[PDB]
Amino acid sequence: VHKMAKNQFGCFANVDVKGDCKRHCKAEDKEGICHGTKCKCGVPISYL
């Protein structure tokens, strides 16, 4: 599957969109950030 809305959890323009980058990072117990047309993790969900 192509690296345009099928690999970045459909996220773009730094927005949490369609596939929600949040969820793929929640598997890792992390926040998910859209960094352009790209999805990475932010920080641990352990906010304390």
mmCIF file of all heavy atoms in Angstrom:
data_model
loop_
_atom_site.group_PDB
_atom_site.id
_atom_site.type_symbol
_atom_site.label_atom_id
_atom_site.label_comp_id
_atom_site.label_asym_id
_atom_site.label_seq_id
_atom_site.Cartn_x
_atom_site.Cartn_y
_atom_site.Cartn_z
ATOM 1 N N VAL A 1 0.839 -1.226 0.000
ATOM 2 C CA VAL A 1 0.000 0.000 0.000
ATOM 3 C C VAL A 1 0.861 1.258 0.000
ATOM 4 O O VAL A 1 1.890 1.294 0.676
ATOM 5 C CB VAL A 1 -1.036 0.046 1.137
ATOM 6 C CG1 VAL A 1 -2.078 -1.059 0.976
ATOM 7 C CG2 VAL A 1 -0.437 -0.063 2.545
ATOM 8 N N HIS A 2 0.452 2.284 -0.756
ATOM 9 C CA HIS A 2 1.256 3.486 -1.036
ATOM 10 C C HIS A 2 1.435 4.398 0.182
ATOM 11 O O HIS A 2 0.589 4.451 1.079
ATOM 12 C CB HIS A 2 0.628 4.289 -2.186
ATOM 13 C CG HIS A 2 0.709 3.636 -3.542
ATOM 14 N ND1 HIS A 2 1.891 3.329 -4.222
ATOM 15 C CD2 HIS A 2 -0.341 3.400 -4.375
ATOM 16 C CE1 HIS A 2 1.524 2.920 -5.447
ATOM 17 N NE2 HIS A 2 0.189 2.957 -5.564
ATOM 18 N N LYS A 3 2.517 5.182 0.224
ATOM 19 C CA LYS A 3 2.819 6.081 1.356
ATOM 20 C C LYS A 3 2.141 7.456 1.216
ATOM 21 O O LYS A 3 2.736 8.506 1.478
ATOM 22 C CB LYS A 3 4.327 6.130 1.655
ATOM 23 C CG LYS A 3 4.976 4.842 2.211
ATOM 24 C CD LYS A 3 4.841 3.554 1.380
ATOM 25 C CE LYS A 3 5.614 2.412 2.041
ATOM 26 N NZ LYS A 3 5.231 1.086 1.502
ATOM 27 N N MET A 4 0.861 7.430 0.839
ATOM 28 C CA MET A 4 -0.038 8.583 0.753
ATOM 29 C C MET A 4 -1.411 8.153 1.274
ATOM 30 O O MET A 4 -2.082 7.310 0.681
ATOM 31 C CB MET A 4 -0.088 9.175 -0.669
ATOM 32 C CG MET A 4 -0.360 8.189 -1.816
ATOM 33 S SD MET A 4 -0.562 8.974 -3.443
ATOM 34 C CE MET A 4 1.158 9.461 -3.793
ATOM 35 N N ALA A 5 -1.776 8.661 2.445
ATOM 36 C CA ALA A 5 -2.921 8.262 3.264
ATOM 37 C C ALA A 5 -3.165 6.755 3.531
ATOM 38 O O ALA A 5 -4.207 6.433 4.109
ATOM 39 C CB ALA A 5 -4.169 8.980 2.735
ATOM 40 N N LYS A 6 -2.242 5.841 3.183
ATOM 41 C CA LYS A 6 -2.305 4.418 3.577
ATOM 42 C C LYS A 6 -1.163 3.967 4.500
ATOM 43 O O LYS A 6 -1.153 2.806 4.906
ATOM 44 C CB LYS A 6 -2.436 3.504 2.346
ATOM 45 C CG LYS A 6 -3.557 3.849 1.364
ATOM 46 C CD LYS A 6 -4.918 3.544 1.970
ATOM 47 C CE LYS A 6 -6.033 3.648 0.929
ATOM 48 N NZ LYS A 6 -6.349 5.048 0.570
ATOM 49 N N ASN A 7 -0.226 4.857 4.859
ATOM 50 C CA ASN A 7 0.886 4.523 5.780
ATOM 51 C C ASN A 7 1.039 5.466 6.986
ATOM 52 O O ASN A 7 1.676 5.112 7.981
ATOM 53 C CB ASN A 7 2.210 4.491 4.993
ATOM 54 C CG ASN A 7 2.465 3.166 4.304
ATOM 55 O OD1 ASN A 7 3.245 2.353 4.779
ATOM 56 N ND2 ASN A 7 1.871 2.915 3.163
ATOM 57 N N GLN A 8 0.456 6.657 6.888
ATOM 58 C CA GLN A 8 0.492 7.744 7.870
ATOM 59 C C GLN A 8 -0.832 7.868 8.634
ATOM 60 O O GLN A 8 -1.172 8.929 9.149
ATOM 61 C CB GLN A 8 0.893 9.053 7.181
ATOM 62 C CG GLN A 8 0.036 9.375 5.948
ATOM 63 C CD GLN A 8 0.649 8.784 4.687
ATOM 64 O OE1 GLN A 8 0.291 7.699 4.234
ATOM 65 N NE2 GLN A 8 1.617 9.456 4.123
ATOM 66 N N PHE A 9 -1.604 6.782 8.680
ATOM 67 C CA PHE A 9 -2.897 6.698 9.367
ATOM 68 C C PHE A 9 -3.879 7.749 8.840
ATOM 69 O O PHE A 9 -4.649 8.332 9.597
ATOM 70 C CB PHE A 9 -2.652 6.680 10.884
ATOM 71 C CG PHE A 9 -1.680 5.570 11.236
ATOM 72 C CD1 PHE A 9 -0.296 5.812 11.174
ATOM 73 C CD2 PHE A 9 -2.148 4.252 11.418
ATOM 74 C CE1 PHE A 9 0.617 4.760 11.321
ATOM 75 C CE2 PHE A 9 -1.235 3.194 11.557
ATOM 76 C CZ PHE A 9 0.146 3.448 11.507
ATOM 77 N N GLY A 10 -3.799 8.023 7.532
ATOM 78 C CA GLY A 10 -4.600 9.044 6.851
ATOM 79 C C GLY A 10 -4.449 10.474 7.394
ATOM 80 O O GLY A 10 -5.296 11.313 7.080
ATOM 81 N N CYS A 11 -3.423 10.761 8.205
ATOM 82 C CA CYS A 11 -3.208 12.039 8.845
ATOM 83 C C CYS A 11 -2.450 12.942 7.873
ATOM 84 O O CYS A 11 -1.559 12.488 7.142
ATOM 85 C CB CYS A 11 -2.535 11.836 10.211
ATOM 86 S SG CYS A 11 -0.723 11.940 10.262
ATOM 87 N N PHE A 12 -2.821 14.218 7.833
ATOM 88 C CA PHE A 12 -2.043 15.210 7.089
ATOM 89 C C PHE A 12 -2.196 16.628 7.659
ATOM 90 O O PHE A 12 -2.951 16.819 8.612
ATOM 91 C CB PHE A 12 -2.359 15.107 5.591
ATOM 92 C CG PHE A 12 -3.499 15.953 5.061
ATOM 93 C CD1 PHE A 12 -3.220 16.986 4.145
ATOM 94 C CD2 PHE A 12 -4.830 15.703 5.447
ATOM 95 C CE1 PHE A 12 -4.260 17.768 3.621
ATOM 96 C CE2 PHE A 12 -5.871 16.493 4.928
ATOM 97 C CZ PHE A 12 -5.589 17.527 4.016
ATOM 98 N N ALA A 13 -1.470 17.616 7.115
ATOM 99 C CA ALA A 13 -1.521 19.034 7.511
ATOM 100 C C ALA A 13 -1.343 19.295 9.026
ATOM 101 O O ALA A 13 -1.851 20.276 9.583
ATOM 102 C CB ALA A 13 -2.774 19.679 6.901
ATOM 103 N N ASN A 14 -0.617 18.401 9.703
ATOM 104 C CA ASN A 14 -0.458 18.341 11.159
ATOM 105 C C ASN A 14 -1.786 18.177 11.946
ATOM 106 O O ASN A 14 -1.931 18.729 13.044
ATOM 107 C CB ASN A 14 0.449 19.482 11.689
ATOM 108 C CG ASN A 14 1.844 19.547 11.122
ATOM 109 O OD1 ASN A 14 2.120 19.250 9.972
ATOM 110 N ND2 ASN A 14 2.778 19.980 11.923
ATOM 111 N N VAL A 15 -2.761 17.435 11.408
ATOM 112 C CA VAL A 15 -4.086 17.182 12.010
ATOM 113 C C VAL A 15 -4.251 15.687 12.329
ATOM 114 O O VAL A 15 -3.664 14.836 11.662
ATOM 115 C CB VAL A 15 -5.226 17.684 11.090
ATOM 116 C CG1 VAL A 15 -6.511 17.948 11.891
ATOM 117 C CG2 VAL A 15 -4.931 19.017 10.385
ATOM 118 N N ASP A 16 -5.065 15.341 13.329
ATOM 119 C CA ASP A 16 -5.342 13.956 13.726
ATOM 120 C C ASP A 16 -6.622 13.544 13.020
ATOM 121 O O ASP A 16 -7.750 13.874 13.400
ATOM 122 C CB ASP A 16 -5.374 13.811 15.255
ATOM 123 C CG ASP A 16 -5.331 12.343 15.687
ATOM 124 O OD1 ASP A 16 -4.247 11.728 15.562
ATOM 125 O OD2 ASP A 16 -6.382 11.821 16.141
ATOM 126 N N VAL A 17 -6.386 12.885 11.896
ATOM 127 C CA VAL A 17 -7.359 12.669 10.842
ATOM 128 C C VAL A 17 -7.437 11.199 10.425
ATOM 129 O O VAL A 17 -6.498 10.433 10.611
ATOM 130 C CB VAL A 17 -6.962 13.633 9.706
ATOM 131 C CG1 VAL A 17 -7.682 13.367 8.375
ATOM 132 C CG2 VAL A 17 -7.296 15.082 10.031
ATOM 133 N N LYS A 18 -8.608 10.852 9.891
ATOM 134 C CA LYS A 18 -9.211 9.561 9.477
ATOM 135 C C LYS A 18 -8.774 8.297 10.213
ATOM 136 O O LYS A 18 -9.583 7.669 10.905
ATOM 137 C CB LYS A 18 -9.070 9.370 7.951
ATOM 138 C CG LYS A 18 -9.855 10.362 7.078
ATOM 139 C CD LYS A 18 -11.377 10.248 7.239
ATOM 140 C CE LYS A 18 -12.057 11.158 6.212
ATOM 141 N NZ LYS A 18 -13.516 11.245 6.445
ATOM 142 N N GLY A 19 -7.520 7.908 10.050
ATOM 143 C CA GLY A 19 -6.937 6.749 10.732
ATOM 144 C C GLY A 19 -6.519 7.049 12.170
ATOM 145 O O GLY A 19 -6.329 6.106 12.939
ATOM 146 N N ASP A 20 -6.459 8.335 12.534
ATOM 147 C CA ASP A 20 -6.120 8.902 13.841
ATOM 148 C C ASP A 20 -4.754 8.410 14.339
ATOM 149 O O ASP A 20 -4.621 7.307 14.880
ATOM 150 C CB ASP A 20 -7.230 8.614 14.856
ATOM 151 C CG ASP A 20 -8.468 9.512 14.795
ATOM 152 O OD1 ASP A 20 -8.776 10.131 13.748
ATOM 153 O OD2 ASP A 20 -9.198 9.559 15.811
ATOM 154 N N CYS A 21 -3.724 9.247 14.197
ATOM 155 C CA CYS A 21 -2.356 8.907 14.596
ATOM 156 C C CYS A 21 -2.267 8.592 16.102
ATOM 157 O O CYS A 21 -1.519 7.699 16.513
ATOM 158 C CB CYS A 21 -1.428 10.054 14.154
ATOM 159 S SG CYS A 21 0.352 9.838 14.432
ATOM 160 N N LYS A 22 -3.122 9.241 16.912
ATOM 161 C CA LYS A 22 -3.393 8.928 18.324
ATOM 162 C C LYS A 22 -3.465 7.414 18.610
ATOM 163 O O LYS A 22 -2.829 6.962 19.563
ATOM 164 C CB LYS A 22 -4.729 9.619 18.674
ATOM 165 C CG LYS A 22 -5.244 9.405 20.107
ATOM 166 C CD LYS A 22 -4.513 10.205 21.189
ATOM 167 C CE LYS A 22 -4.948 11.676 21.183
ATOM 168 N NZ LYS A 22 -4.414 12.420 22.347
ATOM 169 N N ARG A 23 -4.198 6.626 17.808
ATOM 170 C CA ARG A 23 -4.515 5.206 18.093
ATOM 171 C C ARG A 23 -3.330 4.256 17.901
ATOM 172 O O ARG A 23 -3.059 3.422 18.766
ATOM 173 C CB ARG A 23 -5.676 4.726 17.214
ATOM 174 C CG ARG A 23 -6.927 5.610 17.262
ATOM 175 C CD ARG A 23 -8.070 4.961 16.478
ATOM 176 N NE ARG A 23 -7.728 4.690 15.067
ATOM 177 C CZ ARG A 23 -8.091 3.642 14.352
ATOM 178 N NH1 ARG A 23 -8.861 2.695 14.800
ATOM 179 N NH2 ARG A 23 -7.662 3.507 13.136
ATOM 180 N N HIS A 24 -2.598 4.396 16.795
ATOM 181 C CA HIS A 24 -1.393 3.603 16.494
ATOM 182 C C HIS A 24 -0.286 3.839 17.531
ATOM 183 O O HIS A 24 0.404 2.898 17.923
ATOM 184 C CB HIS A 24 -0.954 3.909 15.050
ATOM 185 C CG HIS A 24 0.528 3.854 14.801
ATOM 186 N ND1 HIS A 24 1.320 2.706 14.707
ATOM 187 C CD2 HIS A 24 1.313 4.957 14.674
ATOM 188 C CE1 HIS A 24 2.578 3.160 14.560
ATOM 189 N NE2 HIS A 24 2.601 4.501 14.515
ATOM 190 N N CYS A 25 -0.191 5.059 18.064
ATOM 191 C CA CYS A 25 0.674 5.355 19.203
ATOM 192 C C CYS A 25 0.093 4.900 20.557
ATOM 193 O O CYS A 25 0.866 4.501 21.425
ATOM 194 C CB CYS A 25 1.032 6.837 19.159
ATOM 195 S SG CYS A 25 2.223 7.220 17.846
ATOM 196 N N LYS A 26 -1.237 4.836 20.752
ATOM 197 C CA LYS A 26 -1.838 4.291 21.987
ATOM 198 C C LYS A 26 -1.505 2.805 22.166
ATOM 199 O O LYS A 26 -1.345 2.360 23.297
ATOM 200 C CB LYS A 26 -3.365 4.503 21.998
ATOM 201 C CG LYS A 26 -3.993 4.857 23.365
ATOM 202 C CD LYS A 26 -3.590 4.054 24.616
ATOM 203 C CE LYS A 26 -3.998 2.573 24.590
ATOM 204 N NZ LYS A 26 -3.521 1.873 25.810
ATOM 205 N N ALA A 27 -1.321 2.046 21.081
ATOM 206 C CA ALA A 27 -0.837 0.665 21.166
ATOM 207 C C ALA A 27 0.513 0.595 21.909
ATOM 208 O O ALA A 27 0.698 -0.225 22.805
ATOM 209 C CB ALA A 27 -0.739 0.091 19.748
ATOM 210 N N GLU A 28 1.396 1.556 21.637
ATOM 211 C CA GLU A 28 2.703 1.775 22.277
ATOM 212 C C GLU A 28 2.606 2.479 23.651
ATOM 213 O O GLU A 28 3.625 2.809 24.255
ATOM 214 C CB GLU A 28 3.574 2.649 21.355
ATOM 215 C CG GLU A 28 3.498 2.384 19.855
ATOM 216 C CD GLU A 28 4.212 1.125 19.372
ATOM 217 O OE1 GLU A 28 4.316 0.106 20.096
ATOM 218 O OE2 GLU A 28 4.681 1.162 18.208
ATOM 219 N N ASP A 29 1.392 2.784 24.125
ATOM 220 C CA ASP A 29 1.103 3.660 25.269
ATOM 221 C C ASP A 29 1.752 5.059 25.134
ATOM 222 O O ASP A 29 2.240 5.642 26.109
ATOM 223 C CB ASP A 29 1.350 2.942 26.610
ATOM 224 C CG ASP A 29 0.476 1.696 26.796
ATOM 225 O OD1 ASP A 29 -0.710 1.690 26.380
ATOM 226 O OD2 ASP A 29 0.987 0.695 27.356
ATOM 227 N N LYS A 30 1.754 5.611 23.913
ATOM 228 C CA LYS A 30 2.256 6.951 23.550
ATOM 229 C C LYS A 30 1.152 7.838 22.942
ATOM 230 O O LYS A 30 0.155 7.330 22.432
ATOM 231 C CB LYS A 30 3.369 6.834 22.490
ATOM 232 C CG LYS A 30 4.548 5.914 22.807
ATOM 233 C CD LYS A 30 5.441 6.461 23.917
ATOM 234 C CE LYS A 30 6.501 5.423 24.307
ATOM 235 N NZ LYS A 30 5.897 4.267 25.019
ATOM 236 N N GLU A 31 1.341 9.156 22.921
ATOM 237 C CA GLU A 31 0.536 10.088 22.108
ATOM 238 C C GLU A 31 0.952 9.942 20.639
ATOM 239 O O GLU A 31 2.106 9.608 20.379
ATOM 240 C CB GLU A 31 0.793 11.550 22.510
ATOM 241 C CG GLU A 31 0.308 11.910 23.917
ATOM 242 C CD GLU A 31 -1.224 11.904 24.002
ATOM 243 O OE1 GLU A 31 -1.883 12.863 23.529
ATOM 244 O OE2 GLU A 31 -1.783 10.925 24.545
ATOM 245 N N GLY A 32 0.070 10.239 19.681
ATOM 246 C CA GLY A 32 0.411 10.278 18.252
ATOM 247 C C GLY A 32 0.317 11.688 17.675
ATOM 248 O O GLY A 32 -0.708 12.355 17.846
ATOM 249 N N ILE A 33 1.362 12.134 16.978
ATOM 250 C CA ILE A 33 1.459 13.428 16.305
ATOM 251 C C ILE A 33 1.588 13.267 14.793
ATOM 252 O O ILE A 33 2.420 12.518 14.277
ATOM 253 C CB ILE A 33 2.570 14.344 16.883
ATOM 254 C CG1 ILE A 33 3.881 13.665 17.341
ATOM 255 C CG2 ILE A 33 1.986 15.112 18.083
ATOM 256 C CD1 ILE A 33 4.834 13.294 16.202
ATOM 257 N N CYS A 34 0.765 14.013 14.066
ATOM 258 C CA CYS A 34 0.942 14.159 12.634
ATOM 259 C C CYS A 34 1.979 15.271 12.377
ATOM 260 O O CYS A 34 1.729 16.446 12.660
ATOM 261 C CB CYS A 34 -0.411 14.385 11.964
ATOM 262 S SG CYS A 34 -0.393 13.949 10.221
ATOM 263 N N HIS A 35 3.167 14.905 11.898
ATOM 264 C CA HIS A 35 4.254 15.834 11.513
ATOM 265 C C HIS A 35 4.332 16.051 9.982
ATOM 266 O O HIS A 35 5.264 15.632 9.297
ATOM 267 C CB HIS A 35 5.578 15.443 12.206
ATOM 268 C CG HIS A 35 6.171 14.120 11.792
ATOM 269 N ND1 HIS A 35 7.299 13.968 10.981
ATOM 270 C CD2 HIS A 35 5.705 12.885 12.142
ATOM 271 C CE1 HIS A 35 7.442 12.648 10.794
ATOM 272 N NE2 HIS A 35 6.496 11.974 11.470
ATOM 273 N N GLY A 36 3.314 16.710 9.425
ATOM 274 C CA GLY A 36 3.082 16.873 7.981
ATOM 275 C C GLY A 36 2.109 15.813 7.463
ATOM 276 O O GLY A 36 1.087 15.581 8.097
ATOM 277 N N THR A 37 2.421 15.152 6.346
ATOM 278 C CA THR A 37 1.748 13.931 5.836
ATOM 279 C C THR A 37 2.298 12.649 6.492
ATOM 280 O O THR A 37 2.305 11.586 5.872
ATOM 281 C CB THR A 37 1.828 13.818 4.295
ATOM 282 O OG1 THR A 37 3.154 13.959 3.834
ATOM 283 C CG2 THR A 37 0.969 14.842 3.563
ATOM 284 N N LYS A 38 2.842 12.748 7.714
ATOM 285 C CA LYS A 38 3.597 11.704 8.430
ATOM 286 C C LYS A 38 3.079 11.493 9.858
ATOM 287 O O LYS A 38 2.760 12.469 10.531
ATOM 288 C CB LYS A 38 5.076 12.119 8.518
ATOM 289 C CG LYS A 38 5.748 12.590 7.225
ATOM 290 C CD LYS A 38 5.798 11.486 6.168
ATOM 291 C CE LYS A 38 6.539 11.973 4.927
ATOM 292 N NZ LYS A 38 5.801 13.021 4.187
ATOM 293 N N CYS A 39 3.072 10.256 10.363
ATOM 294 C CA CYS A 39 2.657 9.926 11.738
ATOM 295 C C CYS A 39 3.824 9.393 12.591
ATOM 296 O O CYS A 39 4.437 8.376 12.256
ATOM 297 C CB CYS A 39 1.511 8.910 11.680
ATOM 298 S SG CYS A 39 0.923 8.260 13.273
ATOM 299 N N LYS A 40 4.083 10.037 13.736
ATOM 300 C CA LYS A 40 5.047 9.609 14.768
ATOM 301 C C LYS A 40 4.430 9.722 16.159
ATOM 302 O O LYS A 40 3.338 10.267 16.309
ATOM 303 C CB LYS A 40 6.349 10.427 14.648
ATOM 304 C CG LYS A 40 7.377 9.677 13.792
ATOM 305 C CD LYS A 40 8.674 10.456 13.538
ATOM 306 C CE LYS A 40 9.521 10.687 14.790
ATOM 307 N NZ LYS A 40 10.734 11.474 14.465
ATOM 308 N N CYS A 41 5.117 9.225 17.181
ATOM 309 C CA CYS A 41 4.651 9.383 18.557
ATOM 310 C C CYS A 41 5.241 10.616 19.263
ATOM 311 O O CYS A 41 6.299 11.139 18.892
ATOM 312 C CB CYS A 41 4.789 8.082 19.346
ATOM 313 S SG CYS A 41 4.034 6.608 18.584
ATOM 314 N N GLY A 42 4.517 11.085 20.278
ATOM 315 C CA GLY A 42 4.775 12.341 20.979
ATOM 316 C C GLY A 42 5.509 12.124 22.302
ATOM 317 O O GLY A 42 6.735 12.237 22.356
ATOM 318 N N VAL A 43 4.741 11.823 23.356
ATOM 319 C CA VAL A 43 5.192 11.444 24.695
ATOM 320 C C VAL A 43 4.374 10.254 25.233
ATOM 321 O O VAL A 43 3.297 9.969 24.707
ATOM 322 C CB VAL A 43 5.071 12.642 25.662
ATOM 323 C CG1 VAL A 43 5.923 13.820 25.187
ATOM 324 C CG2 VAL A 43 3.628 13.143 25.832
ATOM 325 N N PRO A 44 4.840 9.543 26.271
ATOM 326 C CA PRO A 44 4.051 8.555 27.014
ATOM 327 C C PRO A 44 2.693 9.079 27.513
ATOM 328 O O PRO A 44 2.602 10.206 28.002
ATOM 329 C CB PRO A 44 4.954 8.138 28.177
ATOM 330 C CG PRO A 44 6.368 8.355 27.645
ATOM 331 C CD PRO A 44 6.210 9.587 26.756
ATOM 332 N N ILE A 45 1.657 8.233 27.466
ATOM 333 C CA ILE A 45 0.294 8.532 27.975
ATOM 334 C C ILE A 45 0.219 8.694 29.503
ATOM 335 O O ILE A 45 -0.795 9.127 30.059
ATOM 336 C CB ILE A 45 -0.719 7.469 27.513
ATOM 337 C CG1 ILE A 45 -0.390 6.074 28.092
ATOM 338 C CG2 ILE A 45 -0.801 7.456 25.981
ATOM 339 C CD1 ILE A 45 -1.223 5.730 29.329
ATOM 340 N N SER A 46 1.278 8.275 30.185
ATOM 341 C CA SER A 46 1.591 8.513 31.592
ATOM 342 C C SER A 46 1.951 9.992 31.815
ATOM 343 O O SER A 46 3.123 10.383 31.849
ATOM 344 C CB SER A 46 2.729 7.572 32.008
ATOM 345 O OG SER A 46 3.674 7.406 30.963
ATOM 346 N N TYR A 47 0.937 10.851 31.938
ATOM 347 C CA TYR A 47 1.090 12.316 31.978
ATOM 348 C C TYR A 47 1.575 12.872 33.341
ATOM 349 O O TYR A 47 1.628 14.096 33.526
ATOM 350 C CB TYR A 47 -0.231 12.988 31.558
ATOM 351 C CG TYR A 47 -0.916 12.489 30.291
ATOM 352 C CD1 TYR A 47 -2.312 12.285 30.304
ATOM 353 C CD2 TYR A 47 -0.197 12.265 29.097
ATOM 354 C CE1 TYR A 47 -2.980 11.848 29.146
ATOM 355 C CE2 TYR A 47 -0.869 11.824 27.935
ATOM 356 C CZ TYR A 47 -2.264 11.605 27.959
ATOM 357 O OH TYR A 47 -2.933 11.177 26.856
ATOM 358 N N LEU A 48 1.884 12.005 34.314
ATOM 359 C CA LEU A 48 2.232 12.317 35.707
ATOM 360 C C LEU A 48 3.539 11.633 36.135
ATOM 361 O O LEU A 48 4.383 12.298 36.775
ATOM 362 C CB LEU A 48 0.995 11.923 36.553
ATOM 363 C CG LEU A 48 1.200 11.929 38.071
ATOM 364 C CD1 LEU A 48 1.494 13.333 38.590
ATOM 365 C CD2 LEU A 48 -0.060 11.420 38.763
#
